[PDB]
Structure formats: structure tokens, C-alpha cells
Scaffold this active site. Sequence first.
Site, mmCIF file in Angstrom:
data_model
loop_
_atom_site.group_PDB
_atom_site.id
_atom_site.type_symbol
_atom_site.label_atom_id
_atom_site.label_comp_id
_atom_site.label_asym_id
_atom_site.label_seq_id
_atom_site.Cartn_x
_atom_site.Cartn_y
_atom_site.Cartn_z
ATOM 1 N N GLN A 48 0.925 -1.293 0.015
ATOM 2 C CA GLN A 48 0.124 0.118 0.112
ATOM 3 C C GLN A 48 0.868 1.229 -0.219
ATOM 4 O OE1 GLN A 48 -4.182 -1.618 1.825
ATOM 5 N NE2 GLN A 48 -2.780 -0.581 3.274
ATOM 6 N N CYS A 55 -19.781 -9.037 -0.645
ATOM 7 C CA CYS A 55 -20.662 -8.012 -1.281
ATOM 8 C C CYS A 55 -22.086 -8.228 -1.341
ATOM 9 C CB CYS A 55 -20.063 -7.896 -2.650
ATOM 10 S SG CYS A 55 -18.552 -7.198 -2.745
ATOM 11 N N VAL A 70 -0.538 1.610 13.402
ATOM 12 C CA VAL A 70 -1.311 2.842 14.267
ATOM 13 C C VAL A 70 -1.247 2.352 15.813
ATOM 14 C CG1 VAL A 70 -3.315 4.076 14.249
ATOM 15 C CG2 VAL A 70 -2.478 3.210 12.108
HETATM 16 C C1 LIG Z 1 -11.390 -0.407 5.396
HETATM 17 S S1 LIG Z 1 -9.980 0.681 5.669
HETATM 18 C C2 LIG Z 1 -9.501 1.407 4.060
HETATM 19 C C3 LIG Z 1 -8.292 2.439 4.009
HETATM 20 C C4 LIG Z 1 -8.441 3.775 3.734
HETATM 21 N N1 LIG Z 1 -8.851 4.506 5.036
HETATM 22 C C5 LIG Z 1 -9.917 4.043 2.883
HETATM 23 O O1 LIG Z 1 -11.028 4.491 3.362
HETATM 24 O O2 LIG Z 1 -9.832 3.530 1.491
HETATM 25 C C6 LIG Z 1 -9.088 -0.530 6.450
HETATM 26 C C7 LIG Z 1 -7.334 -0.028 6.479
HETATM 27 O O3 LIG Z 1 -7.066 -0.318 7.798
HETATM 28 C C8 LIG Z 1 -5.531 -0.356 7.693
HETATM 29 N N2 LIG Z 1 -5.143 -0.889 9.246
HETATM 30 C C9 LIG Z 1 -5.849 -1.766 10.062
HETATM 31 N N3 LIG Z 1 -5.378 -1.918 11.140
HETATM 32 C C10 LIG Z 1 -4.223 -1.130 10.993
HETATM 33 C C11 LIG Z 1 -3.148 -1.017 12.031
HETATM 34 N N4 LIG Z 1 -3.220 -1.591 13.134
HETATM 35 N N5 LIG Z 1 -2.113 -0.282 11.684
HETATM 36 C C12 LIG Z 1 -2.060 0.349 10.381
HETATM 37 N N6 LIG Z 1 -3.191 0.242 9.590
HETATM 38 C C13 LIG Z 1 -4.296 -0.551 9.990
HETATM 39 C C14 LIG Z 1 -5.550 -1.468 6.725
HETATM 40 O O4 LIG Z 1 -4.435 -1.775 6.099
HETATM 41 C C15 LIG Z 1 -6.594 -1.045 5.950
HETATM 42 O O5 LIG Z 1 -6.131 -0.908 4.387
#
Ligand SMILES: C[S@+](CC[C@H](N)C(=O)[O-])C[C@H]1O[C@@H](n2cnc3c(N)ncnc32)[C@H](O)[C@@H]1O
Lengths: 336, 338
Positions: free
Chosen positions: B146, B313, B169
Site C-alpha cells: 500500500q 458483497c 497505528v
Molecule cells: C477499510 S480501511 C481502508 C483504508 C482507507 N482509510 C480507505 O477508506 O480507503 C482499512 C485499512 O486499515 C488498515 N489498518 C487496520 N489496522 C491497522 C493497524 N493496526 N495499523 C495500520 N493500518 C491498519 C488496513 O491496512 C486497511 O487498509
Amino acid sequence: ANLIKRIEHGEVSDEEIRGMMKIQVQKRLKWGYKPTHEQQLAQLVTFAQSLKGMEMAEEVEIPLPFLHIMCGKTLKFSPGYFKDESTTLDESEVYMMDLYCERAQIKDGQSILDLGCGHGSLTLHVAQKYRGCKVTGITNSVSQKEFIMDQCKKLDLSNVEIILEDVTKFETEITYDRIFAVALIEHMKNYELFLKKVSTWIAQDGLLFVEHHCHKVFAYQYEPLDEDDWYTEYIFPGTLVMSSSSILLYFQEDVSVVNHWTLSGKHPSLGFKQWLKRLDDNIDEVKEIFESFYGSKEKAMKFITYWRVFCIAHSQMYSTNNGEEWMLSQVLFKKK
Amino acid sequence: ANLIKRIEHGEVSDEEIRGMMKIQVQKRLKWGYKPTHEQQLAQLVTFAQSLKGMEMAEEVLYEIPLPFLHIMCGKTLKFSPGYFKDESTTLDESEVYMMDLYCERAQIKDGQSILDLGCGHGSLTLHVAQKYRGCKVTGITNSVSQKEFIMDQCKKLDLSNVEIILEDVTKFETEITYDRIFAVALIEHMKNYELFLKKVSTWIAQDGLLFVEHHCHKVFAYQYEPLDEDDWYTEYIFPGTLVMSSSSILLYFQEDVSVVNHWTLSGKHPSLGFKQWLKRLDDNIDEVKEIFESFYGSKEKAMKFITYWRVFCIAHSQMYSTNNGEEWMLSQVLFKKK
Ligand SMILES: C[S@+](CC[C@H](N)C(=O)[O-])C[C@H]1O[C@@H](n2cnc3c(N)ncnc32)[C@H](O)[C@@H]1O
Ligand SMILES: C[S@+](CC[C@H](N)C(=O)[O-])C[C@H]1O[C@@H](n2cnc3c(N)ncnc32)[C@H](O)[C@@H]1O
């Protein structure tokens, strides 16, 4: 319009004030509910923001022997907890106050502040149940403070102090382990200024307990819907705020919610029914008290009528949909 | 459990999956709604309290091939709902509409520093950085590809105002503060929101704001525990105790941030987006098979993963559409530092 004087007359039965109130309940529900959650929410949020544009409270005396008749031992001007319809008015006052003590986590030895203590119902209950506590009650009514002090003498209570002041203007550098605000916020508008001020009175790791009448879902200023809204003009001649159960969640700048509960409208409804029965059971003694205090038999009849309608109208309003429309909300806060 | 195998081998039609999901939502609704407000509130408060004793997030090869996302998701690769101002709005438009809505409700202005938590493939990071050349945008992801995708978009678009941090995060620490923080579809991965909002709030600058969007049910909240023994959806889609928030659950997490505003949006929007994803997947199924056969090395794994995505979906389109979109929906909350 001329509708009321016919009832100051005694011309419609209770049953028909009951029926008039249902019409107003439904018109308020029609006004308040929205077809989508997006709108329901936008209206509550918009309403909370406008409250921050107001004053804390509008800048604006019941004879004691009449309260001794209508209220119950404890002169608790606010709802009881009814386990049954067999619960007596006076069991209901005690039940609700132990509920307060449990939810506010009162412990023996805490300093306690009771904002808007009235005739000291909760102040005297706490002070007797926890003699290690030092209870401070605030009221703006010399009649209420002298009555309470008279009870302290009588019951031999030395842990009770009554400050005579407007809470809105009260200032102190004493903080308190527990603060009570039971049926006070009904008298407030800018919830934000009120919670900000009260928050500076909370001791380290103290708790603020707040109980307020509300609708479950939406909030509103008391102002007539139709041209045909008698009840707001009559019951509330000085505008006030009917809160919603969740509205204090939007006022967590200086306090944070620790717990949150609601109680069915059946509890205030039952309470108002007991107020009406005790009134009517002693109606002649009530007329004598009101003639003495208000100075004439006519103006007395006006006030007896006011109170019966108040109890009738509000017993009906809170019974709406088995108590699931208007109801009680209780909120436990800590500082910061 | 043998249900799944016959799904994967292409027996159970799309309408059977849709009908199964309807049964599942009616059990969930009947589990969740209570006969009195005092009970309803008590469910929610008690569930909130229990979150405060949990991990921020569960600890963890379940990455998606990038050519598959190019097919399913739409030009910015937004992995979160679009805004459909209609049923003639395209997938590509829904993404731009929703993301402009984020920019307006979070009060973005040119020159602000912006942190995007869980930036994914960078839909919001790149949209903001292309819209406001004076902003510095920091994205955070735990995913190497990503981050490499986004740095390549920055090459192609000639943006110099984007920085991607490769990090979890949950464990990230910094002394930098930002005028604006985004967390779009991130708390769906979190358990202890209290601990999460505490960490983040240290990143909010003076007068900064935090914007959170999360899927939710309108009224009650729950963990994905199977409801009865007839429940196949829960541990097929979520085999990891994720949490379905409720629209107001974050009002109870205001110890380190204060609510500035709070909106919801109909479940119709996520419902239509999942439908769009399914259409694009079905319209390119051969290429999808090939991409998956290649990346997962099996014809067998490939069918299992196409099945999962189509079920995901179909089922979620059905759940979010429930009752004209007034059960499961979107919640948007704007916070200031506390
Ligand atoms: C449903 S969202 C999609 C991302 C973006 N915010 C969007 O709206 O298109 C989920 C994102 O959270 C990220 N994520 C989940 N837990 C995470 C963590 N502990 N640290 C970093 N990224 C995390 C995942 O990599 C994933 O791509
Ligand atoms: C319906 S409540 C009853 C109070 C008490 N909690 C009880 O249960 O009996 C109204 C009380 O708020 C008090 N009050 C209202 N505004 C006040 C103010 N600004 N300062 C002090 N007391 C106030 C009134 O004196 C009254 O006793």
C-alpha cells in the site's frame, strides 16, 4: 383562550383534561419525530448548539403546609421509584433516593454537595444514612433553608450545612467528593456553562450525578405548537428546555460520562397520580391554606385548579406509550 | 459447516445467499432490540464499559492482489463507502462525492498538516494532497505494498506533499501534531476505543480536529459472536472478535476528545457501493480468476477467495439495505482535543 376559565370553573371532568392532553402529546410527537435517523440526529445536534448560545438560566413560593399534604414525608419535589402500583408515595421517595446513593457511589466520610436542595429531601436522607458524611445543600430560598435547619435541630443532625445562594452565581474554592443535581437542569438553558461551572467544584476523583426529565429522542423549547396549545401558555407562563435522554452526551467538554441510565415514564406518572389523590383527599384543608396565603377564595381556587391540571396533564403525558416517550435520565460524570 | 464447501463449488445461488442473510439480520435485530429504553441503553452502556478492558486491537498473509482491487474498487481504490446522490451515480463518482464530503465536514483548508490513519491505498491521502497543494499529508499504513503503491501515485501525479509512514497505528509513537486527523473505516478494526482515542488525541494540534467515520448499527452494538448454531455468516466472514459499533457508542468515549459534530448517513450508500463492487467483479470474473490463480497459486484457493468476496458483497449489500437503510448505516463524528 377562554378555555381555562371554564375549568377554573370546574366545567370539564378530569377525563376530558386527560383527553385534551393526549391531543397535545401526539402533536408534539408528530413535530418531534423525523422520517430518517440522519434528520433525527441533525435536529438534536443543532438543538444542542443553540443551547450554547443562551444564558445559563433565565434571570427571573409554595406554602409549606400545602407541600406537607401533596408531596410525602420527605418533601421531595421530583419523582419516586415505584416497584409496583402498590408502592406508596413515601416508599417511592425513599426508593428513588437510595437508587441515587447507589448510582452516585456515595460512601461514609465523603463531602457531599446537593445543588438546588429544595426542602432537603436528599440532603437529610444522605446526612442520616451516612453520619460520617458532611452534606452541603444550596438553595436560593430562605424558607427552604430555615425549614431544613429546623429538621436538623429536630432529628439531631450536625453534619448538614445550608448555603443560601443562586447556584448560577455560587463561587467557592471548596471542592466536593460528590455533587448532586436532581431536577435542577430543568431550570437551565446553557448546559455547557452549567457543567463548566459545576466541574470546578468536583474534588480529585469525585463524581457528579445528574437526573433530568426528558423525551427519549428529541429536545425542545416549551413554546406552543398550534394556535390551540393552551397547555404551554397555562402550565408555563419564561421559556424552558425539555431535554432529550442523550443530550448531555454532547456537553462533555469539562466533565466525562461514567454511566448513563434511564427510567420509564411510569415512575413520574405514578408520582403525579399520588400528588393528585393526596390533593383531592385533603382538598378542604388545601383551600384553607391557599386562602390564607393567597388572600382570597377565588385566587385560591385558581391555584388548586392549576395544580390538579399540572398533575393530570403530566401524569398522562409521561404515561404515553407505556412510559417509553417521556421519562427520566440519570447521568454520572467525573471531572475533566 | 458443509454449507461453505457447496457455496465454494458454485451450488448456492446469489438469491439463496441473499435469503440466508435476510434470516441472519432478522435474528440479529431481534437479539438487539429491547422492549424498553432502560434496557436498550443498559445493553449499550454495558457493552461500552466492556470495551474499556480490552486490547486496542487483536494481533495478527491475507493481502489482496493489487490488480483485483483495480477491478473491484474504482479509480481511487477507496476501500470504504462512497456517497450516492442517486442510483445513476457511478462507483467512481460515489468515491469523489464521499471524500469531498469528508473535506467539508472536517473543515480542511489549504496549508494545514493532515494525518490519515489507516490510509489504505491512499484514496483520501491523494485526494486531499491533490486538492490542497499547500497541505502536507501524512498517511500511516501497516502494509508495504500500500505504501509503495502510493509513492508511485505521487511519482505519476508529481505531488511532493505526501509522506507515507510504514507502521502499525496501534504501536506508532510520534511527537508531531497535526491540524487535521482522519480515521475512515479504521475503528472497525479496533476494540478498546478508549485506549485508541487516548493515543490519537496526543496527535491533535492546538485547535486541531479529528474526523472519524465508522459503520454501525443505529441503536445497539455487539461482537461478531454467532447467534445460534444456524449461524454460518459470522464465522465464515469473521472467523477474530471484531466489534460492530452503534451510531452513538463514541459519545461515551470523550475522556480525551470532545464532540464538535455528529452525523449519520443512510445504509443505502454502503449498500449501493457493495452492489457496485459485485457488478465489477462479476463483469471481470475470468480476469479475477486468473489474478487469484496466479497470486494464491491454486485453482482451489482461487475459487475460495472469489466466493468469499462475492458473499461479502452480496451479504453486506443486503444487511445495509435493511428497512430502507435505517438499521445498519454510517456514523461520522468530528472531535476536538480535550
Ligand atoms: C477499510 S480501511 C481502508 C483504508 C482507507 N482509510 C480507505 O477508506 O480507503 C482499512 C485499512 O486499515 C488498515 N489498518 C487496520 N489496522 C491497522 C493497524 N493496526 N495499523 C495500520 N493500518 C491498519 C488496513 O491496512 C486497511 O487498509
Ligand atoms: C423541582 S426541584 C427540587 C429540588 C430537589 N432536588 C428535590 O428533589 O426536592 C427545583 C429546585 O431548584 C432550586 N433552584 C432553581 N434554580 C436555582 C438557582 N439558581 N439557585 C439555587 N436553587 C435553584 C429551587 O429552589 C427548587 O428547590
